[PDB]
Amino acid sequence: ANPCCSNPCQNRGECMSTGFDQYKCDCTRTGFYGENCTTPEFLTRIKLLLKPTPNTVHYILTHFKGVWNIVNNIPFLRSLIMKYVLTSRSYLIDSPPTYNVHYGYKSWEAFSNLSYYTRALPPVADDCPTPMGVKGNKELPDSKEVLEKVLLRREFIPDPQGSNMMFAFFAQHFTHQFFKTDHKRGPGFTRGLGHGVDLNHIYGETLDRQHKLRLFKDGKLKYQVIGGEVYPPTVKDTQVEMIYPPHIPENLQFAVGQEVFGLVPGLMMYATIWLREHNRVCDILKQEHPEWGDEQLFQTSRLILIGETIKIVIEDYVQHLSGYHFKLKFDPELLFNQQFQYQNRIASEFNTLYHWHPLLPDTFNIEDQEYSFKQFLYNNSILLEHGLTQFVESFTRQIAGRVAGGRNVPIAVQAVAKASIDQSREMKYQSLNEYRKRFSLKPYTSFEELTGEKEMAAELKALYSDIDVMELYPALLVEKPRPDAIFGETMVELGAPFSLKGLMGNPICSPQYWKPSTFGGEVGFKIINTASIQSLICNNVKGCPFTSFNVQ
């Protein structure tokens, strides 16, 4: 019945019903006017004609390597370009946040209730005739059918950008601090009330959990020593609740900030590294400040590790994923004379697009062994048997799977892929092409334009009939990749703005935080400003093994 069901308002105009059979578009500050906000103002037509497409820009950033290495060696210029990268992404995210799974109009409940993931696009109204609004059939195609025909892996498809398992598990570990779906409430709800990079996955979401994980001496976290090596403490020692199957022995129930990180030894590898890093920064700070107590050493270390994480995520992780020859830079000062909101609300669509399970290999290869999924899950004895050094060496060599390009979801996690489809529908997501328009991308005009091939496209066409009815999540995994890239256009163009806010939106990047005294002085500040994935491993893993996010 809802007259806004067909999504009539274009260019981020807002639709409002004005009766049972009429609507009105609010074109305020869109740059467009007219009934559906499709008539561009004069300056808008200029800006449209000038603005290059994301595929054009991507080409430039990934070619002319000779030029980029000149640019990278000129501080002033590199800073200027990075400033552009930061601000060109800015306009896409609503901050303060707006919609969520229950609210397709702005409300105080949607703004104030932090238990919701927010929504970049409002949900399709309950009384719309079709799942996408008015287009398509009364029901979407069978999710198991979509999954089997175009998502499940046949042969393992390796990532051509060379992403390795250090990368894959870093992605899983890093993102699971702000993707923490509260399944008791439903898929549109989160337990990550900090809505960003607060490192609750190391320190715990609550004060009570944090205090159970702390040593309360020298700012440090509790730990145990097994075979001369530092690991996290146990559940028995801390009374911290963790998720473990009943057959796991008490001595192998490791306690960390995030309750699910006992799921896979890969997560536990990173939890151990970051635990070691915290206590390392504690030693440095105590050295610098013998007059400091446990509480301040702890708090200042946590601020520094938040810094290191953002540093590493931008200059190593995102740097690898982007494929750019331009060297990204973590530098909060670049936004100080710009308009920017130092806040963030985690979007449901950010969670959804980040289900990068094709990354996972068919086996996990550590030293000379090849563990199946079944052997790998919930088995930290693997970590104890081989050690961190061997883990890093092995995972740095093992190639991860390609995410875009279709048919590369391992069958071991087919239930997760199927739920991504089912839960996206349950949360009433708009169509793929609605999300492309929301992020300034041209809508795809056929399934072949979407995939770049003919077989999966034909299968998708038999299932969905209309390209305007194609769904966001499956589309992301079948999209035509950029040339020799891990991702297609949609993943990058949706992911970048969400990411930007999560990283630069952190309070430590704001002017009142970004100064040496926040971090215990110039020594603490320098730990943030020199962090890299390589120094993280080198300082905290015996033998200082070489590491990287790509295979060699």
Place this chain on the structure above:
Amino acid sequence: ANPCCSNPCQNRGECMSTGFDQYKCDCTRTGFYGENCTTPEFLTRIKLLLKPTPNTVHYILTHFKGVWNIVNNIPFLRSLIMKYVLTSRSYLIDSPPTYNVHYGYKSWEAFSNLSYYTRALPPVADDCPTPMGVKGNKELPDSKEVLEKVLLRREFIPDPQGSNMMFAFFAQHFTHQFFKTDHKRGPGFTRGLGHGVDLNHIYGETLDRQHKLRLFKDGKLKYQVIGGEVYPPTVKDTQVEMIYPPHIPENLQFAVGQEVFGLVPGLMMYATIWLREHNRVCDILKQEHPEWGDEQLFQTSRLILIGETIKIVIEDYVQHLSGYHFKLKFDPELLFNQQFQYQNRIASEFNTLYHWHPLLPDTFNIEDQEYSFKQFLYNNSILLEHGLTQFVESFTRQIAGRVAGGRNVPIAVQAVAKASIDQSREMKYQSLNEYRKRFSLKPYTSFEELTGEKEMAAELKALYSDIDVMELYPALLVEKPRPDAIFGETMVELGAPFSLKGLMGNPICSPQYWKPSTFGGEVGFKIINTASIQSLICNNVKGCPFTSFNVQ
């Protein structure tokens, strides 16, 4: 022992210990350098030479009435000046917030824990030799002596700006949505987790309380009709928890958003008016949108009432308090091309300065009756006896007390004034002159300069010895007022930046919220942009009695 105990860093430099008996000042972006950040950069010397004092600017704003009358009638000019008013206040508030009662250094706990009031100045460290740091005696003077000698009212001193009881109860009602101290935790903690103007004092702080207050028809709040007049519902009917003495009959236990508003009929008067306003706006919205459900009608009305509140607070309330001839303007668009953070954290010092109890008369005069405090408190039968119209007419006629200038705290609330003092100390507030420097005011050099007189000054000198040991709260109430004004310099220069962030920092003032469709279209938008204390009364009180925040 802490080397930062003497507050050595000037001009908002941050102090950090570097050993047991050494410190370092972080002068980053202060405009100053050198050991205590007192050596001004070149651009700083210039801005210093140009920037006029607050007493000078205030003179200009409260004189040249003829000139202001020209300016007020030139839309472009009036807008431009309000823009400066808004932005000249910005640089004073930390946003994202920094300190709180437990953290004198920046930390994730202080940033993230919303149960704290934030702090404009860090607390004095526990191990400082004196309450103010290093100056003064081992203990501050007896709070009872300070209270009795310079705060307690002898004769009622009327406010020369003509503030009335409509103003006083509006102040109490409005501020008590974000000053809501959690006494179970301590004075530095709040129950107002929204930290601003969310109208939880009407709608309830929690969802469960909100649902108990709602009718779930037509977006409306529950109400009762007594003698043909609309009042809040009862505790018996709603199961909403309220604070009442045991002797209060069930028919008189009104249930409203804020649990303490049964305290005085003055608060209940405003609770009734806003209840009436919410349901009135529901009627208007239902007319515009017959297709809307209860939930959207409720949520949109709440957003509109948030809008009206901020409008009335700026253009009537702050307009009256300021004494300015320039006509202030509520217009979010004025900040859209400015750097500004749409967020707020309620400061402890803001709470402290807003204890405006000298406002209160010795008796409350309604029609021909005169109620004592004992007769007035927790007595809603007074509201029923006289009705809202008579309340408005009476409170519009009765003069309120002057707040600065000393000796005008009503004795009936002396226990509250003594607690303001004792709790400021318990929260380890820094000295008056420290807070003055923090807000770019010149420190006082004697008690006579503070008071502008000789008697109270001599009393204060015998108590405190050193002006640098004078405390913030008592100073506010004994301070020399502006000429025929209600407040002294310190009250205004501290209150304005806090107030600014609370009002303009609201999400509905952000670009993505500030458009007609947020408020149900142009009709809802207009309700916000035409609101006034007079229209609030006229739309909701029988007879449309004249009202004002000043006596006529």
